[PDB]
From Swiss-Prot:
Protein name: Glucose import ATP-binding protein GlcV
Pfam families, per database record: ABC_tran (PF00005), GlcV_C_terminal (PF17847)
Domain ABC transporter: 4-241
Subcellular locations according to the entry: Cell membrane
Top-level enzyme category: translocase
Organism annotation: Saccharolobus solfataricus (strain ATCC 35092 / DSM 1617 / JCM 11322 / P2) (Sulfolobus solfataricus)
Keywords carried by this UniProt record: ATP-binding, Cell membrane, Membrane, Nucleotide-binding, Sugar transport, Translocase, Transport
GO MF annotation, one: ATP binding
The encoding gene: glcV
Superkingdom of the organism of origin: Archaea
Taxonomy of the source species: Archaea, Thermoproteota, Thermoprotei, Sulfolobales, Sulfolobaceae
Length: 352
Protein backbone atom coordinates (compact mmCIF):
# COMPACT_ATOMS: atom_id res chain seq x y z
CA UNK A 1 0.00 0.00 0.00
CA UNK A 2 3.04 2.26 0.19
CA UNK A 3 6.27 2.48 -1.80
CA UNK A 4 9.44 3.04 0.22
CA UNK A 5 12.45 4.75 -1.36
CA UNK A 6 15.63 4.51 0.68
CA UNK A 7 18.11 6.90 -1.00
CA UNK A 8 21.79 6.90 0.00
CA UNK A 9 20.88 6.36 3.62
CA UNK A 10 23.73 6.41 6.11
CA UNK A 11 23.65 6.45 9.90
CA UNK A 12 26.58 7.15 12.20
CA UNK A 13 26.97 7.08 15.96
CA UNK A 14 29.77 8.21 18.30
CA UNK A 15 30.19 11.42 16.27
CA UNK A 16 31.10 9.46 13.13
CA UNK A 17 33.31 6.80 14.64
CA UNK A 18 30.71 4.09 14.14
CA UNK A 19 29.02 3.78 10.74
CA UNK A 20 25.93 1.67 11.30
CA UNK A 21 24.56 2.10 7.79
CA UNK A 22 26.62 3.08 4.76
CA UNK A 23 24.85 4.43 1.64
CA UNK A 24 21.92 2.04 1.61
CA UNK A 25 19.74 2.16 -1.50
CA UNK A 26 16.49 0.17 -1.83
CA UNK A 27 13.21 0.77 -3.64
CA UNK A 28 10.50 -1.31 -1.90
CA UNK A 29 7.32 -1.61 -3.93
CA UNK A 30 3.75 -1.17 -2.81
CA UNK A 31 2.56 -4.33 -1.08
CA UNK A 32 5.95 -6.00 -1.26
CA UNK A 33 7.17 -8.39 1.45
CA UNK A 34 10.77 -7.33 1.98
CA UNK A 35 13.25 -8.75 4.42
CA UNK A 36 16.63 -7.76 5.81
CA UNK A 37 19.19 -10.34 7.03
CA UNK A 38 22.59 -9.54 8.61
CA UNK A 39 25.13 -10.15 11.43
CA UNK A 40 24.22 -6.95 13.29
CA UNK A 41 20.99 -6.87 15.26
CA UNK A 42 21.80 -3.26 16.15
CA UNK A 43 22.37 -2.23 12.52
CA UNK A 44 19.27 -3.96 11.28
CA UNK A 45 17.30 -2.38 14.12
CA UNK A 46 18.84 0.98 13.24
CA UNK A 47 17.52 0.53 9.70
CA UNK A 48 14.13 -0.43 11.04
CA UNK A 49 14.02 2.53 13.40
CA UNK A 50 14.76 4.84 10.46
CA UNK A 51 11.90 3.33 8.45
CA UNK A 52 9.63 3.71 11.51
CA UNK A 53 10.66 7.30 12.13
CA UNK A 54 12.10 6.55 15.59
CA UNK A 55 15.46 7.60 14.19
CA UNK A 56 16.68 9.46 11.09
CA UNK A 57 19.37 9.07 8.45
CA UNK A 58 22.57 10.98 9.25
CA UNK A 59 22.84 11.56 5.51
CA UNK A 60 20.49 10.58 2.72
CA UNK A 61 16.74 10.61 2.24
CA UNK A 62 13.69 8.44 2.90
CA UNK A 63 10.41 8.68 0.97
CA UNK A 64 7.00 7.07 1.52
CA UNK A 65 5.39 7.22 -1.92
CA UNK A 66 6.77 10.62 -3.03
CA UNK A 67 6.64 12.16 0.40
CA UNK A 68 9.98 13.00 2.02
CA UNK A 69 9.71 11.67 5.58
CA UNK A 70 13.33 12.12 6.73
CA UNK A 71 16.45 13.73 5.31
CA UNK A 72 19.99 14.40 6.38
CA UNK A 73 19.53 14.43 10.16
CA UNK A 74 15.99 15.85 10.10
CA UNK A 75 12.73 14.10 10.93
CA UNK A 76 10.13 15.49 8.54
CA UNK A 77 7.15 13.19 9.08
CA UNK A 78 7.05 11.61 12.57
CA UNK A 79 6.07 7.95 13.19
CA UNK A 80 2.45 8.66 14.13
CA UNK A 81 1.86 10.23 10.71
CA UNK A 82 3.46 7.46 8.59
CA UNK A 83 0.67 4.83 8.62
CA UNK A 84 2.91 2.21 10.21
CA UNK A 85 2.20 -0.74 12.45
CA UNK A 86 5.12 -2.00 14.53
CA UNK A 87 5.68 -5.49 15.98
CA UNK A 88 9.04 -5.16 17.68
CA UNK A 89 10.49 -7.61 20.17
CA UNK A 90 11.54 -4.55 22.20
CA UNK A 91 8.05 -3.00 22.20
CA UNK A 92 6.23 -5.00 24.85
CA UNK A 93 2.63 -4.93 25.93
CA UNK A 94 1.84 -2.63 28.87
CA UNK A 95 1.66 -5.03 31.81
CA UNK A 96 -1.02 -3.09 33.72
CA UNK A 97 -3.37 -2.53 30.81
CA UNK A 98 -5.77 -5.27 29.76
CA UNK A 99 -5.55 -6.68 26.24
CA UNK A 100 -8.40 -4.33 25.25
CA UNK A 101 -6.62 -1.35 26.76
CA UNK A 102 -3.37 -2.31 25.04
CA UNK A 103 -5.08 -2.52 21.64
CA UNK A 104 -7.05 0.70 22.19
CA UNK A 105 -4.01 2.70 23.25
CA UNK A 106 -2.98 3.87 19.75
CA UNK A 107 -6.50 5.23 19.21
CA UNK A 108 -6.39 7.61 22.19
CA UNK A 109 -5.91 10.76 20.13
CA UNK A 110 -7.46 9.69 16.82
CA UNK A 111 -10.64 11.70 17.31
CA UNK A 112 -12.75 8.61 17.88
CA UNK A 113 -15.64 8.31 20.32
CA UNK A 114 -15.77 5.62 22.99
CA UNK A 115 -18.08 3.46 20.88
CA UNK A 116 -15.90 3.89 17.80
CA UNK A 117 -12.81 2.79 19.71
CA UNK A 118 -14.68 -0.21 21.15
CA UNK A 119 -16.00 -1.30 17.79
CA UNK A 120 -12.58 -1.07 16.17
CA UNK A 121 -10.75 -2.90 18.93
CA UNK A 122 -13.40 -5.65 18.99
CA UNK A 123 -13.31 -6.00 15.20
CA UNK A 124 -9.56 -6.47 15.10
CA UNK A 125 -9.63 -8.74 18.12
CA UNK A 126 -12.23 -10.98 16.43
CA UNK A 127 -10.17 -11.23 13.26
CA UNK A 128 -7.09 -12.25 15.28
CA UNK A 129 -9.13 -14.58 17.51
CA UNK A 130 -8.40 -12.87 20.83
CA UNK A 131 -11.80 -11.30 21.34
CA UNK A 132 -12.48 -13.73 24.19
CA UNK A 133 -9.45 -12.67 26.24
CA UNK A 134 -9.79 -8.86 25.93
CA UNK A 135 -10.26 -8.48 29.69
CA UNK A 136 -7.05 -10.33 30.56
CA UNK A 137 -3.81 -8.64 31.55
CA UNK A 138 -0.86 -9.76 29.40
CA UNK A 139 0.54 -12.01 32.14
CA UNK A 140 -2.61 -14.13 31.99
CA UNK A 141 -2.34 -14.56 28.23
CA UNK A 142 -0.53 -17.42 26.50
CA UNK A 143 2.51 -16.64 24.35
CA UNK A 144 0.46 -16.93 21.16
CA UNK A 145 -2.22 -14.69 22.62
CA UNK A 146 0.37 -12.05 23.58
CA UNK A 147 1.68 -12.20 20.03
CA UNK A 148 -1.80 -11.69 18.69
CA UNK A 149 -2.50 -8.75 21.03
CA UNK A 150 0.76 -7.14 19.89
CA UNK A 151 -0.24 -7.64 16.26
CA UNK A 152 -3.72 -6.22 16.95
CA UNK A 153 -2.12 -3.15 18.53
CA UNK A 154 -0.01 -2.72 15.37
CA UNK A 155 -3.06 -3.05 13.07
CA UNK A 156 -5.64 -1.03 14.96
CA UNK A 157 -5.12 2.21 12.98
CA UNK A 158 -5.15 0.47 9.58
CA UNK A 159 -1.58 0.94 8.49
CA UNK A 160 -0.08 0.87 5.02
CA UNK A 161 3.22 -0.61 6.24
CA UNK A 162 3.81 -3.36 8.77
CA UNK A 163 7.29 -3.39 10.35
CA UNK A 164 8.54 -6.51 12.14
CA UNK A 165 11.78 -6.63 14.11
CA UNK A 166 12.52 -10.10 15.55
CA UNK A 167 8.76 -10.56 15.76
CA UNK A 168 8.69 -14.26 16.73
CA UNK A 169 11.64 -14.41 19.06
CA UNK A 170 9.52 -14.36 22.24
CA UNK A 171 7.80 -17.56 21.20
CA UNK A 172 8.84 -21.12 21.81
CA UNK A 173 10.35 -22.57 18.64
CA UNK A 174 7.35 -24.87 18.23
CA UNK A 175 4.95 -21.93 17.97
CA UNK A 176 6.81 -19.86 15.40
CA UNK A 177 5.52 -21.55 12.26
CA UNK A 178 1.98 -20.70 13.35
CA UNK A 179 2.97 -17.08 14.04
CA UNK A 180 4.71 -16.75 10.70
CA UNK A 181 1.62 -18.12 8.96
CA UNK A 182 -0.57 -15.59 10.76
CA UNK A 183 1.63 -12.69 9.63
CA UNK A 184 1.45 -14.04 6.06
CA UNK A 185 -2.35 -14.21 6.28
CA UNK A 186 -2.59 -10.67 7.66
CA UNK A 187 -0.36 -9.29 4.92
CA UNK A 188 -2.40 -11.03 2.21
CA UNK A 189 -5.70 -9.80 3.64
CA UNK A 190 -4.59 -6.19 4.07
CA UNK A 191 -2.13 -5.85 1.17
CA UNK A 192 0.22 -3.80 3.34
CA UNK A 193 3.85 -3.34 2.44
CA UNK A 194 5.82 -5.44 4.90
CA UNK A 195 9.40 -5.18 6.13
CA UNK A 196 10.84 -7.85 8.41
CA UNK A 197 14.31 -7.84 9.91
CA UNK A 198 15.70 -10.89 11.68
CA UNK A 199 18.77 -12.92 12.59
CA UNK A 200 16.82 -16.06 11.66
CA UNK A 201 16.65 -16.99 7.98
CA UNK A 202 13.51 -19.03 8.72
CA UNK A 203 11.64 -15.77 9.24
CA UNK A 204 12.88 -14.56 5.84
CA UNK A 205 11.97 -17.73 3.95
CA UNK A 206 8.54 -17.81 5.51
CA UNK A 207 7.55 -14.23 4.89
CA UNK A 208 9.81 -12.29 2.53
CA UNK A 209 9.72 -12.36 -1.26
CA UNK A 210 12.81 -10.23 -1.71
CA UNK A 211 15.62 -9.86 0.81
CA UNK A 212 18.58 -7.61 1.29
CA UNK A 213 21.61 -8.70 3.24
CA UNK A 214 23.44 -6.20 5.43
CA UNK A 215 27.14 -6.71 6.26
CA UNK A 216 29.15 -4.06 8.11
CA UNK A 217 26.38 -1.52 7.41
CA UNK A 218 26.41 -2.22 3.69
CA UNK A 219 23.76 -3.84 1.54
CA UNK A 220 25.84 -6.50 -0.20
CA UNK A 221 23.19 -8.49 -2.09
CA UNK A 222 19.50 -8.21 -2.84
CA UNK A 223 17.28 -10.89 -4.31
CA UNK A 224 14.76 -13.69 -3.80
CA UNK A 225 15.63 -15.81 -0.75
CA UNK A 226 16.26 -18.89 -2.90
CA UNK A 227 18.65 -16.90 -5.12
CA UNK A 228 20.71 -15.75 -2.14
CA UNK A 229 20.64 -19.35 -0.90
CA UNK A 230 21.91 -20.94 -4.11
CA UNK A 231 23.88 -18.00 -5.57
CA UNK A 232 25.35 -16.07 -2.64
CA UNK A 233 27.82 -13.34 -3.57
CA UNK A 234 30.15 -14.29 -0.74
CA UNK A 235 30.66 -17.01 1.83
CA UNK A 236 29.39 -14.58 4.48
CA UNK A 237 26.10 -14.13 2.68
CA UNK A 238 25.98 -17.89 2.09
CA UNK A 239 26.13 -18.53 5.83
CA UNK A 240 23.69 -15.77 6.78
CA UNK A 241 20.95 -17.30 4.64
CA UNK A 242 21.49 -20.89 5.83
CA UNK A 243 23.85 -23.54 7.17
CA UNK A 244 26.95 -24.10 5.13
CA UNK A 245 30.35 -25.75 5.39
CA UNK A 246 33.23 -23.37 4.66
CA UNK A 247 36.55 -24.91 3.62
CA UNK A 248 39.76 -23.43 2.29
CA UNK A 249 42.00 -25.13 -0.23
CA UNK A 250 44.59 -24.84 -2.94
CA UNK A 251 43.61 -24.22 -6.54
CA UNK A 252 45.05 -26.87 -8.91
CA UNK A 253 44.53 -28.04 -12.51
CA UNK A 254 42.61 -30.94 -11.07
CA UNK A 255 40.43 -28.90 -8.73
CA UNK A 256 40.54 -27.30 -5.28
CA UNK A 257 42.50 -29.60 -3.01
CA UNK A 258 41.79 -29.87 0.72
CA UNK A 259 43.72 -32.84 2.10
CA UNK A 260 42.15 -35.97 0.67
CA UNK A 261 39.29 -34.03 -0.92
CA UNK A 262 39.33 -32.42 -4.35
CA UNK A 263 36.44 -30.24 -5.61
CA UNK A 264 36.10 -29.90 -9.39
CA UNK A 265 35.94 -26.12 -9.51
CA UNK A 266 38.42 -23.29 -9.91
CA UNK A 267 38.95 -19.57 -9.39
CA UNK A 268 41.72 -17.22 -10.55
CA UNK A 269 43.42 -16.92 -7.14
CA UNK A 270 46.05 -19.13 -5.46
CA UNK A 271 43.62 -20.47 -2.89
CA UNK A 272 39.85 -20.76 -2.71
CA UNK A 273 37.00 -20.92 -0.26
CA UNK A 274 34.58 -23.75 -0.89
CA UNK A 275 30.99 -23.54 0.33
CA UNK A 276 28.95 -26.74 0.48
CA UNK A 277 25.67 -26.93 2.35
CA UNK A 278 25.01 -30.00 4.55
CA UNK A 279 22.12 -31.18 2.37
CA UNK A 280 24.56 -31.27 -0.55
CA UNK A 281 26.91 -33.74 1.11
CA UNK A 282 26.49 -37.54 1.35
CA UNK A 283 28.77 -40.07 3.07
CA UNK A 284 29.31 -43.79 2.40
CA UNK A 285 31.76 -46.56 3.16
CA UNK A 286 31.92 -47.79 -0.44
CA UNK A 287 30.86 -46.28 -3.74
CA UNK A 288 27.16 -45.65 -4.23
CA UNK A 289 25.12 -46.19 -7.37
CA UNK A 290 23.71 -42.72 -7.97
CA UNK A 291 24.99 -40.49 -10.75
CA UNK A 292 23.32 -37.40 -9.20
CA UNK A 293 26.19 -37.30 -6.68
CA UNK A 294 29.92 -36.89 -7.38
CA UNK A 295 32.86 -38.23 -5.41
CA UNK A 296 35.24 -35.64 -4.00
CA UNK A 297 37.41 -37.96 -1.90
CA UNK A 298 37.96 -39.70 1.42
CA UNK A 299 37.34 -38.43 4.92
CA UNK A 300 37.23 -39.56 8.51
CA UNK A 301 34.44 -39.07 11.02
CA UNK A 302 35.49 -36.65 13.76
CA UNK A 303 32.34 -36.29 15.87
CA UNK A 304 28.61 -36.92 15.89
CA UNK A 305 25.82 -34.79 17.24
CA UNK A 306 22.12 -35.58 17.53
CA UNK A 307 19.46 -33.07 16.61
CA UNK A 308 15.94 -33.10 15.23
CA UNK A 309 15.99 -36.89 15.27
CA UNK A 310 18.95 -36.85 12.90
CA UNK A 311 22.64 -37.48 13.27
CA UNK A 312 24.92 -34.54 12.55
CA UNK A 313 28.06 -36.18 11.27
CA UNK A 314 31.22 -34.08 11.10
CA UNK A 315 34.12 -35.34 9.03
CA UNK A 316 37.49 -33.97 8.10
CA UNK A 317 39.57 -34.92 5.10
CA UNK A 318 42.66 -36.99 5.76
CA UNK A 319 45.64 -34.62 6.21
CA UNK A 320 43.38 -31.64 7.04
CA UNK A 321 41.57 -30.06 9.98
CA UNK A 322 38.86 -28.54 7.75
CA UNK A 323 35.40 -29.79 8.62
CA UNK A 324 32.30 -30.85 6.75
CA UNK A 325 29.08 -31.72 8.51
CA UNK A 326 25.96 -33.29 7.12
CA UNK A 327 22.76 -34.86 8.52
CA UNK A 328 21.81 -38.52 8.36
CA UNK A 329 19.25 -41.14 9.36
CA UNK A 330 21.98 -43.49 10.60
CA UNK A 331 25.29 -42.84 12.32
CA UNK A 332 28.76 -43.55 11.03
CA UNK A 333 30.88 -43.81 14.12
CA UNK A 334 33.85 -41.65 15.05
CA UNK A 335 37.12 -42.66 13.45
CA UNK A 336 35.47 -44.37 10.49
CA UNK A 337 36.88 -43.72 7.04
CA UNK A 338 34.23 -42.67 4.56
CA UNK A 339 33.81 -41.59 0.98
CA UNK A 340 32.53 -38.02 0.50
CA UNK A 341 30.06 -37.14 -2.22
CA UNK A 342 28.58 -33.77 -3.06
CA UNK A 343 26.04 -32.25 -5.43
CA UNK A 344 28.31 -30.87 -8.17
CA UNK A 345 26.04 -28.01 -9.16
CA UNK A 346 25.78 -26.90 -5.54
CA UNK A 347 29.48 -26.35 -4.91
CA UNK A 348 30.08 -22.67 -4.21
CA UNK A 349 33.55 -21.28 -4.73
CA UNK A 350 35.11 -17.92 -3.92
CA UNK A 351 38.56 -16.42 -4.28
CA UNK A 352 40.50 -16.30 -1.04
Amino acid sequence: MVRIIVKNVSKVFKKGKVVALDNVNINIENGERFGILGPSGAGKTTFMRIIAGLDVPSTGELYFDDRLVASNGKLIVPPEDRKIGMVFQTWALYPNLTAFENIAFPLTNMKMSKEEIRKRVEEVAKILDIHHVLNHFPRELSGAQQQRVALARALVKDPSLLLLDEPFSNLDARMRDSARALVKEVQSRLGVTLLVVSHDPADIFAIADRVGVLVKGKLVQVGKPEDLYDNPVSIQVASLIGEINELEGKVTNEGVVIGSLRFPVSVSSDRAIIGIRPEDVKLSKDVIKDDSWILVGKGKVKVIGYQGGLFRITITPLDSEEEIFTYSDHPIHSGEEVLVYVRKDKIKVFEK
